[model samples]
Target: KYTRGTVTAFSPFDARADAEALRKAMKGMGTDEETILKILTSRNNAQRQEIASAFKTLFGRDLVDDLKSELTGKFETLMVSLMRPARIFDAHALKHAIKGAGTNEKVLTEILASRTPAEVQNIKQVYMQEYEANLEDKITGETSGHFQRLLVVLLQANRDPDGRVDEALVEKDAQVLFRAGELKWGTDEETFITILGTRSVSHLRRVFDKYMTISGFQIEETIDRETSGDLEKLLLAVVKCIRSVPAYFAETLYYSMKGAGTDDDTLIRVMVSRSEIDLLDIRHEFRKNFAKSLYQMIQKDTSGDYRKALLLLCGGD
Candidate 1:
């Protein structure tokens, strides 16, 4: 039920043939940018892995390395991101977000808030493997206070598994959240974090509904009034993800492309990561919420090979 990815496995496939085609695309003087983008953008990640291995065997060259050498700018970034395992891609993104002087809290929030517990676990493992450091430790060093706590809670990968929701528990959580925020003078940020962080999305959806009935205000409104800074952003992201992950992504895409200049890193990350997961649903939500198709938005905001690569990843209008 969850899979609504735009890109699917290309059938009648031969990894070796794909490898040869890719090699030919990049061979000699000028690169065949169309062929390269078409092949990489159409193939599923696992299939891309096979093609990468085939390329290595056939031509003794790393597919990603060759692509990097041939492609430039955002197009290269998008293509290289496509070649990594999804978990590793996420791991790299997290590492990049957390590393250096200032943290990319938006990246941290988008990824940690939206991923499934299983996906988060794999990302933690891969982060450790790739960086030779504990993901938790790195995050702790980079972030502080309630935002850090919520992220650590999410990194635990201990959200209740998808299944039935408990009616009594839902009511209890709603009351807890209401009291934690609107019902109290100073907001109990821990209560907000613990409940929102650990509860299943299905369970939280029920809690959010019940919260409105109890408080006469949306949970999001209470969050806005009570919290500020990164904690507020992370909390809102969790709530949005629970409400509708695709809608959350649609909004993320909208903001990335809106205003002065594009946040291409976020734009690229969302488009690439969700392309094979929920880009179709995100595209639908984009048109529904933003009054324009994602395809059209990309075309308007970007140009050249980068625009074409993003358009391909966007699937169709």
Candidate 2:
């Protein structure tokens, strides 16, 4: 049954006493470490910043910097993201981290693969404001056109958080994608070029669905037939992100845990960073693609205390 639940807002904004109460809860509790970690990790970007700042004033250190210093590598990466500053700086800083002598493409993958076009736009704005250079221009210079182009589209980030499906756009985009891929007499390079270059994931998503229904082939299948470049895979991955992210993970997971043992850090970082927000969705995706639940994969892929922490935070009973 539908039921409305409410109490009240603590204040218009500041709840000094509430903040103090939370502070005491963090400090006095016996398992305060786990509680504080969970509490800090659970909030969305805006709420998190409030806690981060409050944590500092109450605890005497910048929360993210402190966590960064304490954690290492990917764990550090995930933990620091909890501070939730503007993603534009986050994207640009991450781009710099990956572009030079030794690129950590895992971080690159996380940023590029995960962000929507809207989020990327925020980064572009920040990139221009902070660096006095157009982010598009910089990204083009730094990345190959294909890979760079996918980011460019993602940088456009247009899907609604509420997932409102636009039928008209979908039908039009599907036909657009279908022509780009299937109506190739010699090559409808124009169609391929158009969909490839267009800057809208939401529209692209609808197009892909339509393209598949019309062509009877997946978007990835069409991309492979129509194009050959690293950019093709990246673009297809982004498209696949909309179709089903777990399929993306089905591909990403084998590599994530494919080695002699586990890439323990990536596993921890991904689950840890993702847990408080979108991990449930990701978990569902894992099961959908693998025919086994996310925990089944994790139990086989990771072990010990870290895995325990992660599964708990996955928040599924």
Best by lDDT: 1
Enumerate residue pairs that collide in model 2: 88-123, 117-156, 117-157, 118-157
Q: Give the per-residue lDDT digits (tens) of candidate 2, residues 1-317.
A: 11111111123444344345445543442323344444444444566567666766776855666555454544345445544563444555565754557655345545566655556667667767766777666556666644665556556564344356778767876776676556432255444544544535566666766777888877677566325555555556556665655456544654566557776555654554444445666666666766766666665765443444445555534
Candidate 2, superposed: residue stretches over 4 Å from native: 1-36, 42-45, 72-77, 84-93, 102-114, 129-133, 146-150, 153-190, 196-216, 222-228, 245-255, 258-277, 303-305
Model 2 compared with the native: what TM-score? 0.65
Go through the candidates in order and give the clash count of each.
Answer: 0, 4
Best-matching candidate per TM-score: 1
lDDT of 2 at 229: 55
Work out candidate 2's RMSD over C-alphas: 6.5
Local lDDT at 117 for model 2: 59
User: Over all chains combined, what TM-score does candidate 1 have?
Assistant: 0.93
Worst 10 residues of 1 by lDDT: 180-189
